[PDB]
Paper text:
The ring-like structural maintenance of chromosomes (SMC) complex MukBEF folds the genome of Escherichia coli and related bacteria into large loops, presumably by active DNA loop extrusion. MukBEF activity within the replication terminus macrodomain is suppressed by the sequence-specific unloader MatP. MukBEF is the SMC complex of E. coli and other enterobacteria. Its SMC subunit is MukB, which associates with the kleisin MukF (Woo et al., 2009; Zawadzka et al., 2018).
To gain insights into how MukBEF interacts with matS sites during chromosomal unloading, we purified P. thracensis MatP, identified a cognate high-affinity matS site, and introduced the E1407Q mutation (hereafter, MukBEQ) into MukB to slow down ATP hydrolysis (Woo et al., 2009). We then reconstituted a complex of MukBEQEF dimers, MatP, and an 80-bp DNA oligonucleotide containing matS close to one end in the presence of ATP and magnesium ions. We obtained a reconstruction of the DNA-bound MukBEF monomer part at an overall nominal resolution of 4.6 Å. MukBEF adopts a compact and highly asymmetric conformation, with its ATPase heads bridged by the kleisin MukF. The head-proximal arms of MukB are open to allow accommodation of two distinct DNA double helices. One DNA is bound by MatP and threads through the inter-arm space near the joint. The other is clamped by the MukB heads, MukF, and MukE. It partitions the two DNAs into topologically separate compartments: the “ring” delimited by MukF and the MukB arms and the “clamp” delimited by MukF and the MukB heads. The DNA double helices have a crossing angle of 60°, which is close to what has been estimated for negatively supercoiled plectonemes (Rawdon et al., 2016). The MukBEQEF-MatP-matS complex is prevented from hydrolysing ATP and shows a state prior to unloading.
Numbering used by the authors:
A (entry chain E): 2 to 213
B (entry chain F): 9 to 80
C (entry chain B): 248 to 297
D (entry chain B): 1138 to 1235
E (entry chain J): 1 to 135
F (entry chain I): 1 to 134
Write the structure that this text describes.
Amino acid sequence: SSTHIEQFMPVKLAQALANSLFPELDSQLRAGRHIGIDDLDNHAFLMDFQEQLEEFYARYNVELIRAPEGFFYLRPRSTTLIPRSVLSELDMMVGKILCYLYLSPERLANQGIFTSQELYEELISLADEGKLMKFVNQRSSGSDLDKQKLQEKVRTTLNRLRRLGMVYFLPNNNNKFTITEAVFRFGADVRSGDDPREIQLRMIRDGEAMPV
Amino acid sequence: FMPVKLAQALANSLFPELDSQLRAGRHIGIDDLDNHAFLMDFQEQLEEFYARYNVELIRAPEGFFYLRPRST
Amino acid sequence: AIRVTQSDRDLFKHLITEATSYVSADYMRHANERRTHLDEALALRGELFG
Amino acid sequence: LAYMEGGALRSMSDKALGALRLAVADNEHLRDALRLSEDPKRPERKVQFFIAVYQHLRERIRQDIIRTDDPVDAIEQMEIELARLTEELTAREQKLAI
Amino acid sequence: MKYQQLENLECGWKWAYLIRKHQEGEPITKYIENSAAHAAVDKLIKLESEPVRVLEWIEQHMNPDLFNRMKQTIRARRKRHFNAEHQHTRKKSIDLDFPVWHRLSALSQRRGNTLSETIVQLIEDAERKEKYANQ
Amino acid sequence: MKYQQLENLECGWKWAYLIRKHQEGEPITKYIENSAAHAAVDKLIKLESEPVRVLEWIEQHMNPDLFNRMKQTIRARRKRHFNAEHQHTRKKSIDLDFPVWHRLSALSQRRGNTLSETIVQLIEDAERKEKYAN
DNA sequence: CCACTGTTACATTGTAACGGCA
DNA sequence: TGCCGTTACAATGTAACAGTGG
DNA sequence: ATATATATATATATATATATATATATATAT
DNA sequence: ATATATATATATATATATATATATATATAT
């Protein structure tokens, strides 16, 4: 009959969109924030009405995607109604390193709580110090001023990732943080045991990762 | 539940583009005939929908619509 | 977790037992009447031939 | 059941259907299959519905360790898990009291 | 009693009959007031998955008119359901033109036997002619 | 064309048939999405008392696979409606036990006649046999 | 007696398959 | 071919008659 | 013929939720 | 190195719903 919700929208989708949690979750998602198991309320909300939200967001030409690790996010399409952006290469370095720390048992004593200094030390341990520094400044040759510049850049990238939900600052401390499973996306190019050059094409075709 | 007319307005195929442009701060005037008519018709419900975001859907005296963010 | 797992176990048990009870009974019935009808039919066939 | 006669089989099938009606009201397509299974001209329908029931409980498995997709097999693993959770609950309530 | 009465089946039949009658627009309820009738119908709807309570809903709100039609329809449905098992007990529905049916019914009422019996006698006379032609 | 078709009658027939099918659960519309199907069904429901627009509704939202069934149902409805005026043109429906029906259909298929023609011929032969004996 | 059951003879609506005809 | 009459069913609902046992 | 119990209306003030304004930390960019 | 933008937290005032206690008129036991 008329004046009846099923005329325009499914009942469960309307119930989900009328829930008190919908607005904060939608604003965060459109901002690019990933959702992990830690946000128990938001994660459960996404799980319960997961299908309604993928079909709703499809209207924006963006896929609400749940990675096998269990974290939801948004991937815009080429015809996205919501703009799209790509992380910096330094952001990739810090995200890969963050995934390593999530999987690294040596730092188990930290119990998941990490400081930016430790992250930088691990980054320089695994990466090429000076050749990575080259991107921070084209004229760097190990100068300690440029060293501090790279430290500051790493801190800034860490803050941006915090904005993306890959990392949480502690309820009182902004100098310490706890990693989230979302960081696993930084390894999507290696989660499959195949040739790297074919997986990169598969991902870029899927829209997962553009090149630089 | 949800208001019925609010569901009708949200379901309308014009809603995604208009919503994106509003959340981007764009002002919808009389020139955008379809969007302006849609907002005119469904203002009573979009005001509540965007007040759920602690934002105000304002129709200026000139007529154009826009979103004013609150402190929250 | 305990509540959810207990509910799941009870539901599985009840569904499985009731479905088996519902189906196997009629299956055995149909089998028994099939045997009986075959037995009945043989005698008619034998008499008819002569 | 081979010994009994048709009347008892019919009666117990009716009782099983009565239990099912309560046990199936939540589901829509499974309930519809149960309803269709009632036609006497097509006994095979019954079996189909039975399959559906399995085809239902297969998807209700929670995580990988309980993926003994044979539903009758998952019961033992689930009972083991209930017993385990009982011990953890005892420990946890002791901890909360202290 | 020739046909076994099954409670959980006849109850479902009765519930389906009531719902069908209501959706056809008939006043299954005994209430003339709109509100009580609507409430009783709503309760009956809730009773979908509990056929056992349908007998009680009948005893509380069923229209007094419907006892005869109810007891007729469920009886016929039971007979048909039990006869449908085997072909030789089934029934076949056919349509006859008015002149043909008039003659056949007059003949049957003359012989004092059912239509199937009259057809049996007729086809048997024809087959007797065929048999004596064959020998 | 033997029976003249009347729009205000056949359109009411079509509306009643579609409402019956929808109430029975049949998918009336071609829209898989539930929202569009419900909207079209509501349009139909509020469309009562209208031939010229129920026809258009059928043309625009009707399920492709139901066209033939609806057409033949309306054919049968028209024929029955026109034949139900006179007694001699009406049709009488009866139920025959399966063996009797099997034998009668065997005869009808053998002789190429219809059930009515076969029974008429047989009754005439029975009367002729009576006269032969009498 | 009275009630409940089994059975027959319809009606009512829907559907698939033939066959005629533009 | 696609419409249009026509047949032969299927499924369900009812009235009427005949039986049966309490 | 009386006084107490009831129902009604009213102001009091208690609490919640909202919305505003200011201070703070601090992360960016020239 | 510092101007500037942004997010968060707290205090403060508004507006509304609601429970409490009292005042007034009527009903009914004494």
